[PDB]
Amino acid sequence: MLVLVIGDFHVPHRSAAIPQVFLDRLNTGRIQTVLCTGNLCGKETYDILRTLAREVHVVKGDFDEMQGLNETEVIKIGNFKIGLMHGHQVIPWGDREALAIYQRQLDVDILITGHTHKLETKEVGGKYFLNPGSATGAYSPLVDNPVPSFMLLEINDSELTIYEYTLVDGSVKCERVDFN
Ligand SMILES: [Zn+2]
Ligand SMILES: [Zn+2]
């Protein structure tokens, strides 16, 4: 059960494009579902991930402009419950305790966050925190030299493996972690 985690590739009124290294590798990857943190470029992007997975899971962020969306959602893949949201509501942004209380509040095992534009996967009390980072290296007050990034995760029941993909200076890097 291998799912794509990505998002956060736009900000209000700023230029960005879509790498086809991620697409060309992910187009054939045989991904059943997709987990998105949000801030889509628009209707031109939210279908690209329908070429990737038949089921796409989207939520709202600071500069989302579509309709028919929820700002939070919870998912059960394998034996893993995971909570999806953008994190633009979490104040302060990226604070270690706020994510924790949100994670006891949502009764998830894993909480995806966005809006920091970094990859940052930190595990605590058996709880996993995954941030896709800026999928196209979008500009944020947090980062001015950002890298495009995303994360794939295969959940075989209780065993979960993560793949940290970063397009660093023309080189594609994968940093894989094995969890059980
Ligand atoms: Zn963002
Ligand atoms: Zn954002």
TrEMBL record:
One GO biological process term: protein transport
Which CDD domains does UniProt cross-reference here?
Answer: MPP_Vps29 (cd07394)
| GO cellular component term, pick one | cytoplasmic vesicle
> Lipid metabolism: is it a keyword of this entry?
no
Instruction: Outline the extent of the Calcineurin-like phosphoesterase domain.
Output: 1-157
User: Which residues participate in Zn(2+) 1 binding?
Assistant: D8, N39, D62, H115
Q: Name one GO molecular function term.
A: metal ion binding
Keyword Metal-binding assigned to the entry: answer is yes
**Keywords, comma-separated and alphabetical:** Metal-binding, Protein transport, Transport, Zinc
InterPro entries according to UniProt: Calcineurin-like_PHP_lpxH (IPR024654), Metallo-depent_PP-like (IPR029052), Phosphodiesterase_MJ0936/Vps29 (IPR000979), Vps29 (IPR028661)
Q: According to its UniProt record, which protein family does this protein belong to?
A: Belongs to the VPS29 family.
Q: What is this protein called?
A: Vacuolar protein sorting-associated protein 29
Q: Which source organism does the UniProt entry give?
A: Entamoeba histolytica
